[PDB]
Design a protein around this ligand. Structure first.
Ligand SMILES: CCCCCCCC/C=C\CCCCCCCC(=O)OC[C@H](O)CO
Ligand SMILES: CCCCCCCC/C=C\CCCCCCCC(=O)OC[C@H](O)CO
Ligand SMILES: CCCCCCCC/C=C\CCCCCCCC(=O)OC[C@H](O)CO
Ligand SMILES: CCCCCCCC/C=C\CCCCCCCC(=O)OC[C@H](O)CO
Ligand SMILES: CCCCCCCC/C=C\CCCCCCCC(=O)OC[C@H](O)CO
Ligand SMILES: CCCCCCCC/C=C\CCCCCCCC(=O)OC[C@H](O)CO
Ligand SMILES: CCCCCCCC/C=C\CCCCCCCC(=O)OC[C@H](O)CO
Length: 270
């Protein structure tokens, strides 16, 4: 079926690009345009399949996330770091505060000024930031592992997450870049970005799904579902492959890829 095929394709796109630093939103406006799936219900279907990508992070970091909110299951938590420190909820809170504050003050201002030309610029500037992070990061990470991160790095990553309010910038791209610039290794900054994404995207999805509840009907449920679980499965593959890959390559190829996507935005919309 046309509808379910679209849901699977967009689910694959969402699951691949939500946690790679390449702007799921940038890919979604392109693919949704090439499939004819563009209206108000499409912009809420894409909010719903973002819950699928979240769930993949929740599943992969299950024991870590529950431990952060004070629920520890049996075996002690796997320690990832060179120090005796442990990532805490304060790290997560500090990483949330800046984008939460700026998001609440400017979310409506950003949404009403949406445009594919802005996503194109965000794809380029975000790619340039990734390049700058790779070029300017210290030779020796200050936080090689997730549990080595400081309140200060977490808060600075939180400040960089405000760049994600710019559509097309890639929440993951902004936070990993800011993390790398603060001396967090690629791997640990990627993990922290994914953990941070759980409260950020769950709050953002609940907010946009509430404001857009009027569009939905009973007939969208079968399509909204197939995209959810496609995004979930693909994100599960993507996160696991990305974390294995980012130990061996840099973000230079992702930054260059974003330049290609930005050109694709221009040729598809202009
Ligand atoms: C949904 C639209 C498509 C999804 C968008 C995908 C974005 C991928 C872009 C750039 C990644 C390039 C780097 C990843 C490719 C590396 C392949 C590889 O094999 O690198 C291993 C190397 O040998 C080291 O060990
Ligand atoms: C498509 C529209 C996109 C619009 C936005 C694009 C604007 C580009 C801005 C800056 C790029 C050039 C950056 C300048 C590079 C400086 C390099 C440097 O300073 O070198 C120091 C060196 O590392 C000492 O060791
Ligand atoms: C070769 C095939 C085509 C390749 C694409 C065309 C090349 C120019 C395109 C985009 C600008 C890339 C900007 C590169 C910025 C520096 C890259 C780099 O060497 O990173 C430094 C390193 O990580 C620390 O020393
Ligand atoms: C907030 C929005 C984001 C805006 C993003 C603008 C993009 C700037 C473009 C290129 C900068 C690249 C600078 C590269 C300078 C290289 C310096 C260097 O060589 O490294 C020094 C030292 O080794 C390090 O620890
Ligand atoms: C956790 C849930 C993710 C987001 C859940 C989506 C938000 C809950 C559903 C909702 O808000 O719908 C209420 C409606 O506006 C009035 O009946
Ligand atoms: C870490 C992972 C790095 C590896 C990188 C992942 C490689 C994924 C490659 C292709 C998937 C994209 C397939 C889905 C997009 C194609 C469908 C599409 O674009 O729809 C256009 C439509 O058909 C026109 O009418
Ligand atoms: C229509 C849309 C098409 C979009 C097209 C994309 C535009 C790419 C822009 C700038 C890339 C060049 C800026 C890279 C400059 C960084 C080089 C640098 O900073 O040097 C590395 C450092 O010295 C290491 O030691």
């Amino acid at each position: 079926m046309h509808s379910l095929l679209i849901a699977a394709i967009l689910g694959v796109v969402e699951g691949l690009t939500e946690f790679l630093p390449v702007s799921s939103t940038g890919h979604m406006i392109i693919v949704g345009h090439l499939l004819g799936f563009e209206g108000d219900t499409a912009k809420t279907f894409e909010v719903v399949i973002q819950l699928g990508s979240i769930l993949a992070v929740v599943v992969m970091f299950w024991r870590r996330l529950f431990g952060l909110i004070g629920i520890h299951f049996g075996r002690p938590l796997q320690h990832e770091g060179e120090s005796k420190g442990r990532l805490t909820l304060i790290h997560i809170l500090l990483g949330m505060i800046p984008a939460v504050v700026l998001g609440l003050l400017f979310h409506d201002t950003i949404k009403s000024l949406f445009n594919p030309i802005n996503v194109m610029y965000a794809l380029v500037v975000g790619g340039l930031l990734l390049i700058a992070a790779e070029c300017l990061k210290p030779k020796e990470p200050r936080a090689p592992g997730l549990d080595d991160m400081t309140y200060r790095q977490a808060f600075m990553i939180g400040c960089f997450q405000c760049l994600a309010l710019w559509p097309g910038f890639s929440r993951s791209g902004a936070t990993i870049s800011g993390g790398m610039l603060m001396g967090v290794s690629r791997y640990a900054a990627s993990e922290f970005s994914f953990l941070l994404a759980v409260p950020m995207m769950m709050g953002a999805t609940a907010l946009d799904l509430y404001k857009s509840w009027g569009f939905l009907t009973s007939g969208d449920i079968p399509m909204f579902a197939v995209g959810f679980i496609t995004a979930f499965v693909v994100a599960l593959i993507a996160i696991k492959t990305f974390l294995q890959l980012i130990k061996r390559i840099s973000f230079i190829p992702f930054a260059i890829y974003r330049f290609i996507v930005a050109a694709a935005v221009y040729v598809v919309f202009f």
